[PDB]
Ligand binder design. Structure first.
Ligand SMILES: [Mg+2]
Ligand SMILES: [Mg+2]
Ligand SMILES: [Mg+2]
Ligand SMILES: [Mg+2]
Ligand SMILES: [Mg+2]
Ligand SMILES: [Mg+2]
Ligand SMILES: [Mg+2]
Ligand SMILES: [Mg+2]
Ligand SMILES: [Mg+2]
Ligand SMILES: [Mg+2]
Ligand SMILES: [Mg+2]
Ligand SMILES: [Mg+2]
Ligand SMILES: [Mg+2]
Ligand SMILES: [Mg+2]
Ligand SMILES: [Mg+2]
Ligand SMILES: [Mg+2]
Ligand SMILES: [Mg+2]
Ligand SMILES: [Mg+2]
Ligand SMILES: [Mg+2]
Ligand SMILES: [Mg+2]
Ligand SMILES: [Mg+2]
Ligand SMILES: [Mg+2]
Ligand SMILES: [Mg+2]
Ligand SMILES: [Mg+2]
Ligand SMILES: [Mg+2]
Ligand SMILES: [Mg+2]
Ligand SMILES: [Mg+2]
Ligand SMILES: [Mg+2]
Ligand SMILES: [Mg+2]
Ligand SMILES: [Mg+2]
Ligand SMILES: [Mg+2]
Lengths: 167, 131, 120, 205, 111
RNA sequence: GUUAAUGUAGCUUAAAUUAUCAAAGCAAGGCACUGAAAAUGCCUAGAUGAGCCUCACAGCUCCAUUAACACCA
RNA sequence: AGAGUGUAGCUUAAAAGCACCCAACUUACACUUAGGAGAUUCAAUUGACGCUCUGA
RNA sequence: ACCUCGGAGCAGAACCCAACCUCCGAGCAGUACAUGCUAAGACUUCACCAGUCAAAGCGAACCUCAAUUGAUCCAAUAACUUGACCAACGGAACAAGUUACCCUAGGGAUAACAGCGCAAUCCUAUUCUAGAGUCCAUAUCAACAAUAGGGUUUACGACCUCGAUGUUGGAUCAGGACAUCCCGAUGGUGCAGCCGCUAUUAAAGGUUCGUUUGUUCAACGAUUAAAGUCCUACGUGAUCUGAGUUCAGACCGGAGUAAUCCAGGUCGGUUUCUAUCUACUUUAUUCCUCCCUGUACGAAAGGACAAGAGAAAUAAGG
RNA sequence: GUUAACCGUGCAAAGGUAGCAUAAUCACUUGUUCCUUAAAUAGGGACCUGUAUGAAUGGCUCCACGAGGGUUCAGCUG
RNA sequence: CCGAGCCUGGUGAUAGCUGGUUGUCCAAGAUAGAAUCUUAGUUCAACUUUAAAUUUGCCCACAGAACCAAAUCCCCUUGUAAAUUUAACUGUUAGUCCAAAGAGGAACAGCUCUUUGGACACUAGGAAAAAACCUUGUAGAGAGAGUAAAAAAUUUAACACCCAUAGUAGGCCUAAAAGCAGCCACCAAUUAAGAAAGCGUUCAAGCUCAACACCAAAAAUCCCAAACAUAUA
């Protein structure tokens, strides 16, 4: 007995007669990349996944990278630091929102707060609880702070302009 | 139920391999195994040109098998004019080839002649030998 | 090896000349079969020996009514040779509680619900 | 070269494992060479059978001694004998496993062409010695042409369309209409009702 | 004469012991094999004789999935570095979907 | 027919691998010449096709050959 | 003159993934580690520069 | 020859699956020494015994292999432990020959004689033209092969019989088949005649006596028209023979330490029955002499048919 | 190795000696030859590969003898 | 009656072996194997019985089981009513043929060996008689009735009539090869006759053809029902 195949079979569009003229992976990390691509195709047979599932900014960037590429003489290529406070101050403006939505979706915030229906928080909210008198322990999007520090109301800033807040 | 309509979902036999003269009527040669000979009185320039030839074959997707080396000869200077004495040895590297396109041949050869280094004899031919 | 026969499903398909041959039609199928056994279950394998006992065809030439559902049709599709299927066609409908007492079979498969012993 | 070469008994690379007589190799139609290639006329095999080395010598003698090598040519379609046949010494009881290898055969099914011939002639030129060699093969065989083979297949096909009898073998056996699969074989679903055992029944549709 | 001997080994009685759909409790044997047939997927361990013992209680499943071998497995990485560019292997795997949740929280005291 | 045994310098024996000694043969050295005695040397696919290792060697595949068995109605 | 048009070598890429190069190992190739070079032809869907093709 | 364990095929897709069935292998080696302790759940070589796998935990880092083996009682030692090629491998703790001097229980479950099945072997008929036959396929013979038929060989099978189906030849009497030895009738011939060869038809009738051997056979002497092939429980032992083979004795050679043993040979070796039943119990051939005549035929040598007459001989009846 | 007296070569405790012979003596065997017969797988006398003869497991001849076992001339007798 | 006397006693020696095992009736009832000085046997498993407790057993559908054909397993619905478990047991475990996939043997056997399925050891009808094929099963009385399976068809080989002259004994090679020993070529005269397709010659020569023209059965005691082509399935 032989039932016919439903969907297009894998390795069906590569098996020619001239197999000495195919590209033929010489590595392992090429094959692992092309294999971990295949965890996303719909795959008609059976999956693990079924049962388990502007131009001014560009010109400014190409000028600023041109400046920083020639200025460091490349002396610290063969030991830089990349100051993290500056990186965070730029990341909260630019791709903080694009990343905190991922944290919300992995925590499942939208399937609890809004029953789904995701959104991108465009305004960063710097909230910090008063630990004694100093310091202030900031709450990020997924932090751990105990009910001891949260006995009193925290300090909230956002750098925006009429609002309402809910905890 | 199953052999069945996911039969052959994985078969590592037809995909992988197993285990003369390219006869090739009309398009006459489409050559078989040529051995190209880089001989020099230097060792290193011939080795460099062998590496360059190998990378050029892998760049233009021509298939090669073996970049083996014949035993290096020893000749003194021929003591022929007082008689004069200095040993200058000839090193030898040989790069095989397997395939070719026939119409393509002259371009590959021209790039070999054009990029050919200094004091290095190039020789293409066919095969019968042992190391 | 003599094994269990499995029939391809392009046999159980009616060509349009068969609707002239037998009176049935695909629109409005009969709801009930009448099965009568017309072959002994001996010299026939044990699965056919128990499918006949499941369908309740122990006595040959005895009619049983059965559902026209695909599960029961599939059980019939392994003993299709030992039996005789006729669609129970009803001129008058199902019997009422005062009509259960006087019914009969009337081969050609017409369950009449008023059976008198008098001519026409 | 326009002549059948010498086919050698007992292949020069011998066999050292004694295979069983896998008796599928005689039954039914051929999946192997049923067609003509670089030729015109041939031998059709209307039934299965083994071929010894004796029939090979018989064909190589009976075509070459009666064919003129300036006008006609001949090619085999069958290989040299490869299947070993095991034969005990005579006068021995049952027991003790299989005996030694005795000889070698080649199996041919029905419909597989055996000897193919062509050249600057016609079918009536070849048919004489072809029915000479064809009667001595160890099954029912026949001489055929590329034209007559096609006309015979047209007749065998037209008989599938001509019969008024509503019960074919393929209406009954595929459906198992009488529970008749108890009596039939599993190969009678695919061969058809034509083949029975070794022989091929050509008149039966 | 009977120059042959020795072939009196019995049958191994290996195969699928738990086909797809069966509810399998913890520690049960799913399959037994030589010369690997099914590979372990989720929550399926492997014994020394390539047995596929089930680790968590649930229902067994069978899925074709792409096979990425261990790198120190030198047996199949030579297959990997000889596969062509469009090649993905697709071995078969056995899983279990776990049925019971790991634990619920129960009210024990009022303090 | 079955087991078992054997394969050698040219002939026979040996040696637990490696391969001898003794005739045959090849030259020679002495009396007029052979012989004899000696002395040099020579002559072993160790009967087969592979090498698991490295094989008279140790297991086949062999191909010749040799004995025992071919049974108290 | 008209036409196909236009991302670095390629793209059912949108400043990217591949390709590519030089060392270090490898006879070499490769693998890998190290490093390297890079682009939306020019102004507000249109315009004029770049090839290619169709010409005399 | 084998006896245990493992892999592959038969057994193509859960599992299982025989064989004096086809092929390979195993009676180990190597590395760690947490090859530590405990403990849910399973599988399982179709029983069991055996085997297998194993999450959690305690304690510590931070096994490869296919098989690679042996139970209990026992022998050690203070303990943990360790002991068989017990390989007839689920193992009796230690035991071989020969019986024809044999005995008993049985077995047609199991062999020899016979019947039966088969038709490998055998025999015959065809199909096909390779080749012989000076040429010439077919007067005659026939290779490589093909298809049917026979059931006389040597086999194989083990279905009837072991609370007995008596055996090889011979005598006696034979019955049947025809695939005919002659006698009869034809056809062909590389048939001149006489002889022959061969094919069709024919089963009315007959098919010798001896020497040797137990002989059927075979060899040979003499004959004849010819000295047919077979089958009938290798016809027929309640008709007979027992010379062989086929008991107890015995030698010779050989094997064996010996008992003994030998399709190797040789001398000797009880062959029973009074008939119950069925059945049954009186119905012409051939050769040769003569003649035809030395005629037909051939060149002769040689040499007949058919027609006629006479003599026998056996068979049957008197 | 020259059917070899002869030579080489091992092994052995010794290498079957005298005799005798197709036998009562594995097989090849109805051996070969002469006598007997019209015809002799029988009998007698020789020939030795007896390749499994043989010396008190006794060997070889011979006088008498045998209800021995085979051969025979002559008579003779259903 | 001596391979070791006879008689008593141990002695009802023992016997995996043979034979026998005595009233009536009814119900359920068939053979995977594993070991074994064991294959003439026994133990365990399987099957079977009986009594119980308890719940699912069969049949099955999408899905699903591997790389190097028939089919199977798992499997809800569905039709049904059996199944599992406990308790107590014996007996079979020396089996045949048919169909199918195979293996050994001769692609022999009423042959041997496994697997799937039958029947057979169980009655009844049929294929003549009949274990195994086909019909059919749960029972009694009837001098009722409808059914199932159920009876071999073949009979065959005629065939052309007529006409024939030449370049030319086509070249080569052969003692000679003349259409026909073997090679090369295969044109051409008239209407039409091949540089010849079988013969037949030492070579020749003669016959033809091609062309015009004309219009399947054989064996042994005695064959084996009798027969019968035509009044309506
Ligand atoms: Mg096996
Ligand atoms: Mg077994
Ligand atoms: Mg079990
Ligand atoms: Mg752990
Ligand atoms: Mg045992
Ligand atoms: Mg005696
Ligand atoms: Mg005695
Ligand atoms: Mg007795
Ligand atoms: Mg019997
Ligand atoms: Mg019996
Ligand atoms: Mg017999
Ligand atoms: Mg001839
Ligand atoms: Mg039997
Ligand atoms: Mg008897
Ligand atoms: Mg009796
Ligand atoms: Mg006759
Ligand atoms: Mg006499
Ligand atoms: Mg006499
Ligand atoms: Mg008799
Ligand atoms: Mg008597
Ligand atoms: Mg009698
Ligand atoms: Mg006496
Ligand atoms: Mg009587
Ligand atoms: Mg003797
Ligand atoms: Mg006498
Ligand atoms: Mg007793
Ligand atoms: Mg017993
Ligand atoms: Mg009953
Ligand atoms: Mg034992
Ligand atoms: Mg049988
Ligand atoms: Mg003439």
């Amino acid at each position: 007995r032989r039932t016919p195949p439903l969907g297009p079979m894998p390795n069906s569009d590569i098996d020619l007669s001239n197999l000495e003229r195919l590209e033929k992976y010489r590595s392992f990390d090429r094959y692992r990349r092309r294999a971990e691509q295949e965890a996303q195709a719909p795959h008609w047979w059976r999956t693990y996944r079924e049962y388990f599932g502007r131009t001014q900014q560009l010109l400014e960037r190409k000028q600023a990278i041109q400046e920083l590429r020639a200025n460091v003489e490349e002396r610290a290529a063969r030991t830089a630091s990349v100051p993290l406070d500056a990186v965070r101050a730029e990341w909260e403006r630019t791709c903080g929102p694009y990343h905190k939505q991922r944290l919300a979706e992995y925590y499942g915030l939208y399937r609890d707060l809004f029953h789904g229906a995701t959104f991108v928080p465009r305004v960063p909210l710097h909230v910090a609880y008063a630990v004694g008198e100093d310091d202030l322990m900031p709450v990020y999007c997924g932090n751990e702070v105990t009910p001891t520090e949260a006995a009193q109301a925290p300090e909230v800033t956002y750098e925006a302009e009429l609002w309402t807040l809910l905890l | 139920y199953k052999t069945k309509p996911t039969h052959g979902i994985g078969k590592y036999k037809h995909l992988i391999k197993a285990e003369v003269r390219a006869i090739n009527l009309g398009t006459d040669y489409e050559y078989g195994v040529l051995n190209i000979h880089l001989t020099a009185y230097d060792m290193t320039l011939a080795e460099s040109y062998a590496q360059y030839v190998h990378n050029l074959c892998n760049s233009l997707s021509i298939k090669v098998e073996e970049s083996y080396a014949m035993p290096t000869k020893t000749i003194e200077v021929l003591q022929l004019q007082m008689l004069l004495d200095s040993v200058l040895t000839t090193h030898e590297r040989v790069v095989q080839i397997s395939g070719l396109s026939a119409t393509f041949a002259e371009i590959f050869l021209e790039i070999i002649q054009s990029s050919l280094p200094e004091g290095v004899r190039l020789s293409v031919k066919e095969h019968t030998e042992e190391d | 090896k003599f094994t269990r026969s499995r029939i391809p499903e392009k046999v159980f398909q009616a060509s349009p000349e068969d609707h002239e041959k037998y009176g049935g039609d695909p629109q409005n199928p009969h709801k009930l079969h009448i099965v009568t056994r017309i072959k002994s279950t001996r010299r026939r394998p044990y699965w056919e020996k128990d499918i006949i006992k499941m369908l309740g065809l122990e006595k040959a030439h005895t009619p049983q009514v059965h559902k026209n559902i695909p599960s029961v049709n599939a059980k019939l599709k392994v003993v299709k040779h030992l039996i005789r299927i006729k669609p129970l066609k009803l001129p008058q409908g199902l019997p009422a509680e005062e009509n259960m007492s006087n019914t009969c079979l009337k081969s050609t498969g017409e369950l009449v619900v008023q059976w008198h012993l008098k001519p026409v | 070269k326009p002549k059948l070469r010498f086919i050698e008994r007992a292949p020069l690379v011998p066999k050292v494992r004694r295979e069983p007589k896998n008796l599928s190799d005689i039954r039914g139609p051929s999946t192997e060479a049923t067609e003509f290639t670089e030729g015109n006329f041939a031998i059709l095999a209307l039934g299965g059978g083994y071929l010894h080395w004796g029939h090979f010598e018989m064909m190589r003698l009976t075509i070459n001694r009666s064919m003129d090598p300036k006008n006609m040519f001949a090619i085999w379609r069958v290989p040299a004998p490869f299947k070993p046949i095991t034969r005990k010494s005579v006068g021995h009881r049952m027991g003790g496993g299989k005996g030694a290898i005795d000889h070698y055969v080649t199996p041919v099914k029905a419909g597989r062409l055996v000897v193919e011939m062509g050249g600057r002639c016609e079918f009536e030129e070849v048919q004489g010695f072809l029915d000479q060699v064809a009667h001595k093969l160890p099954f029912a065989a026949k001489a055929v042409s590329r034209g007559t083979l096609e006309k015979m297949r047209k007749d065998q096909e037209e008989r599938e369309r001509n019969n008024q009898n509503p019960w074919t073998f393929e209406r009954i056996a595929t459906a198992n209409m009488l529970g008749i699969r108890k009596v039939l074989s599993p190969y009678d679903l695919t061969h058809k009702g034509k083949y029975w055992g070794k022989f091929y029944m050509p008149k039966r549709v | 004469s009977s120059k042959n001997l020795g072939g009196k080994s019995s049958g191994r009685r290996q195969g699928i012991k738990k086909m797809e759909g069966h509810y399998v409790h913890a520690g049960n044997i799913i399959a037994t094999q030589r010369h690997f047939r099914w590979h372990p997927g989720a929550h399926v361990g492997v014994g020394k004789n390539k047995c596929l013992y089930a680790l968590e209680e649930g229902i067994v499943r069978y899925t074709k999935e792409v096979y990425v071998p261990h790198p120190r497995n030198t047996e199949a990485v030579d297959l990997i570095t000889r596969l062509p560019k469009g090649a993905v292997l697709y071995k078969t795997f056995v899983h279990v979907v776990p049925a019971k949740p790991e634990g619920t929280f129960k009210l024990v005291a009022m303090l």
